[PDB]
Amino acid sequence: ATRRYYLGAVELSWDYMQSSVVYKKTLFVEFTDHLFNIAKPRPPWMGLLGPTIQAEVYDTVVITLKNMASHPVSLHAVGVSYWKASEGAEYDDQTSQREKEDDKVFPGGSHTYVWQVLKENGPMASDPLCLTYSYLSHVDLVKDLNSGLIGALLVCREGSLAKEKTQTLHKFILLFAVFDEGKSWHSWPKMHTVNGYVNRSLPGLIGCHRKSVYWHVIGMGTTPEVHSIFLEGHTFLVRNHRQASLEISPITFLTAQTLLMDLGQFLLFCHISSHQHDGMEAYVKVDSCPEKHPKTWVHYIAAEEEDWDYAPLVLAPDDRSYKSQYLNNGPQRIGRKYKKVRFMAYTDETFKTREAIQHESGILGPLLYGEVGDTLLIIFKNQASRPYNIYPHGITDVRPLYSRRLPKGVKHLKDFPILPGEIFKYKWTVTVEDGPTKSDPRCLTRYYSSFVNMERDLASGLIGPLLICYKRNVILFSVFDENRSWYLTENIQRFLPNPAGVQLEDPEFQASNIMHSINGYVFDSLQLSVCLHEVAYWYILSIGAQTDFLSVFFSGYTFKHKMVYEDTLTLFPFSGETVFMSMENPGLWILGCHNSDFRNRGMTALLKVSSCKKTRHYFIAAVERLWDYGMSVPQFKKVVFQEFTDGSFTQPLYRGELNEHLGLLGPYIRAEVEDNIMVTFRNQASRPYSFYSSLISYEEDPRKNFVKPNETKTYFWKVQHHMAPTKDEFDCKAWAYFSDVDLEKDVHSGLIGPLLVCHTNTLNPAHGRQVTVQEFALFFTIFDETKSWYFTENMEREDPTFKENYRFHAINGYIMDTLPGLVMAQDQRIRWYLLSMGSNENIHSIHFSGHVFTVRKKEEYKMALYNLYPGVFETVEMLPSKAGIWRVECLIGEHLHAGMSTLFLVYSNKCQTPLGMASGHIRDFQITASGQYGQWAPKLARLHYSGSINAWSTKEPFSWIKVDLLAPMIIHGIKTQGARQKFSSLYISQFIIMYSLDGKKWQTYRGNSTGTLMVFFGNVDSSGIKHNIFNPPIIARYIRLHPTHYSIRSTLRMELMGCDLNSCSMPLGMESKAISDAQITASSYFTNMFATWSPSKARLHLQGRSNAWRPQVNNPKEWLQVDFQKTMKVTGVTTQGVKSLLTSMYVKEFLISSSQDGHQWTLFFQNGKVKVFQGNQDSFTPVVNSLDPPLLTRYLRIHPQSWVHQIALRMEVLGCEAQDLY
């Protein structure tokens, strides 16, 4: 079936803590009937959310909006397909008027939408019972979301709604959103809610006791702002990975399930210690719906105070500011040795003998292992001037030993302080529900700490690692905030030249204490020692203040993450992950953090390894070039990689057609696994730079990587498997390369590029591409020019709000739909590469308008919105099923509105029509030349022209002929003939091509061919119709044929094959009897004998006796009718006349009326009045009448007015298909 939904934007009033400060919003809401009188019974626990739209596969959601509010809206879906008349975004998709009705519904309003849920829109084999999608009104997106325009779009797989078994309980939908009721359609507080409720006020979330439960998470909120959801009683399931936090991002779709198993009420809340999220919590009741041996670890631990040297033996002699603020004592500087309290491991309840400490574990307590089924036995004894505690994260059973019942008036063991000298015996037990689930690494990483004051307890050093594994090398990123540590005063009075030197809230004072630590140490002090070929695990944490997300990275290294290989790992605050690197690369490396404002403050450490058939070849150089992003004006000097040729970096290897989407991006540098990459890098530009790909697998024997200007480096390495994809992956995978002298200061410059590593026999012949599938590359960032190496020099053109457009939002460098190259086939796989790089603004949420896609990590998950944390280079695949112009956005307004978008062209590859050069529909004044030479005018250069003279020709040796389709078009193919004079064969044999979109900016042509330009091959005689195809098609309006080699005289007769932009040119099958004779009827059919001019015979080019429609009469009314029997979109009428028995008969002037249901008609008005269509001056030449308002309808009629001799019609409708309402 299809299931029709009724809607309405309906501006309503909202105050959060209810079903007292009231706020004004607008809110989708179902209505019962097309009358739009009654509303729909909506359950209490929804709140704002637009109704839950449940669609199967092969279904046809219809919808029917009604903007009852005081502003335009839309109905942009995500994750389903729609006929362009049902998108919902105004951008120059070069589409009609009837197809931008959907873009913005006005007040009063209406419009019906229709949605498709294709087999491609459905969910994969390892995808849930139902995908999680939304929809949002999409006029202004910032204002649309903050006002409460968002719904739940569910795409349940084929056959799945027969009320599955006993559906009874099942699922609820959570909209962890951040309505900023300030910057909305009515302009205040950034109101963190959950379905529209703040502060534990969300009524209805009810589970079953043993039955599980299914959450359809939806992120929302129009500006980065990370989030982090816990259900405190519980752990979450996504894919089949055990997760604690639903680490939701800007705009995000998840499908988590959790298994309630303990009765009660649990605080579905939002952690993130960055103070805020006022609210972002709500309650989750769970009542009871009706009808190889486990070992036992022992640990004697205690919490004893101590002196802590943050950076110890480090030479750290700097007194020239910055680094020194942290490590050197002075006038109002505690310095670097602060007093702290940590955990400490002993041997027995005597608590008199510590156990052997170790570097590579600074400040973090002992390692607590824990297999599933195993039991831990934590015996804890405080030893400090304060009451501390020890609770674990992840393990859920945690009652004290011996007895279950909790002690004094305490409700939970978390907040039961341990008085400074007593001994508590804890018993932790691990059940499978706390451990890994096949799809995650054998050990998951977890922490444990004190819970009498979650913050300051940990800011003193009360932290330690705990693993939960199935049936060493701990790294902890910790921002210890001394100014919250208890022992601060006990440190001032001991380390300051006057304990009266209070100051306190001095920014420089406080900021000189946020020590930025790895494990325990700072500033390249945590030097760890691992030999070669050791195959190591790395349990990696991020606990502390932090409140950002860290982008951790080993240097020249690569860890198997979630089954798949990666380079940068994103840890959210209070999250741990396990990564598996096979350390097969020598040298000394750094264990950094990317986020600049960190590694520049200490957070670094060193790795120090060492011990105890083809050859792909690239020539890239770093050229200083000038930019402007969107001129189609301030211009900025940037620097990019550029692919060259000779070792003498002379020829710059121009790119075209295929590589016109990089612009900023350096050149694709591809490789098959187990051959050799060699990049010969030369430095043009000012300042030195480099080329580091993290893959550069060196050879044994700090490893400089400096490239002073005019100098050249050779990187050469064998591309291994811990680089290549992985059976379950894709036929290729993307890494990245840039310069590693300043990691990011020389990237806002522009040095960036994609590096592919394809499977073992997929990189094809001498093309060195894959040709099977169109690969691309979208690099989303947010270029900050004020940070460049050239912000001085870029004074070729007082920091308040003058930044604004010193910060460009750049898909590949082109702000605001300024990105070209995105020209794609129709039905044809495409392998997009998705990156993001920079600061933590960059959690970009990329959305392929109208389009879904899929991605692979040891399984195949169908997605439709992929969030790009910086460092993560993905790789997706999609086949576009509809031809038009679409968008790649960034669904967070303030980041999209500021200009982060581009379009891509999908063209129907069965659309290939003669532009009109032969038929003449290309008029003479469109065809220009370069010295007509003489009488062989260029206005002749048409195919098949016959008349002794009949071509363009020129003695001149360097010439050219150009056209102009009047419009930008898909120039898809050119033919080529020649002429003959006397006994001479006039032909061209070797010609190139130029094209442009204004007439004064020509580009050559480079498709596939391995040269500076494609060199075509003309004819060999006076009739060799040579059909050259541009299989990398041409988008242009002005094409220009340049000959290079010629017999006798360069002389040509051509004809251009192409289609319009939105692929609407091919005939609707009049001539090829694809429209049954019965589908055509007319007012009158002249007939007697040797006749029957039946209206059935109106087909263009039709031959034979009695071969046109002819009314019995011949009056200026009359008509011919064409019931398409399906709503097509008509974009032109080709019309023609016949000659019968020395009586040429045609039709001079006709006009078109279009019905819809067969009896209600409307004449094609033009500029108010009616349009008299010209055409047909003789009795054979067809004449095409394009329509500037491309008429719709399934019915069509031709009325002939002024004719000639008699009325003889022959036609062929020029159109294409669609589907308008229902």
Ligand SMILES: *[C@@H]1O[C@H](CO)[C@@H](O[C@@H]2O[C@H](CO)[C@@H](O[C@@H]3O[C@H](CO)[C@@H](O)[C@H](O)[C@@H]3O)[C@H](O)[C@H]2NC(C)=O)[C@H](O)[C@H]1NC(C)=O
């Ligand atoms: C939701 O829960 C939050 C969490 O407590 C509530 O926050 C409290 O909100 C009130 C007003 O909405 C704040 O009052 C104001 O406090 C400031 C700072 O002291 C003071 O200068 C003002 O004159 C006013 O008294 C209150 O401080 C704040 N609690 C905090 C910040 O801890 C909130 O009220 C709840 N409801 C909503 C709708 O947010």
Ligand SMILES: *[C@@H]1O[C@H](CO)[C@@H](O[C@@H]2O[C@H](CO)[C@@H](O[C@@H]3O[C@H](CO)[C@@H](O)[C@H](O)[C@@H]3O)[C@H](O)[C@H]2NC(C)=O)[C@H](O)[C@H]1NC(C)=O
């Ligand atoms: C080594 O690098 C230096 C960098 O200054 C090169 O010197 C410069 O070379 C360029 C080559 O075209 C000369 O042309 C001019 O460049 C300036 C930019 O500096 C540009 O704005 C102009 O339009 C012009 O094309 C430039 O005069 C020259 N500058 C100096 C001070 O010598 C040098 O060529 C490199 N080494 C070799 C062997 O080429």
Ligand SMILES: *[C@@H]1O[C@H](CO)[C@@H](O[C@@H]2O[C@H](CO)[C@@H](O[C@@H]3O[C@H](CO)[C@@H](O)[C@H](O)[C@@H]3O)[C@H](O)[C@H]2NC(C)=O)[C@H](O)[C@H]1NC(C)=O
């Ligand atoms: C120059 O352009 C591309 C290089 O990017 C060449 O790739 C060809 O692209 C087409 C469609 O985009 C591919 O067609 C498909 O091929 C498979 C394999 O048989 C077939 O099963 C599909 O049904 C479809 O026909 C084509 O394979 C691919 N490669 C080749 C060698 O044709 C394109 O061919 C080049 N064009 C010219 C004129 O040289």
Ligand SMILES: [Ca+2]
């Ligand atoms: Ca549209």
Ligand SMILES: [Cu+]
């Ligand atoms: Cu964004």
Ligand SMILES: [Zn+2]
């Ligand atoms: Zn939150």
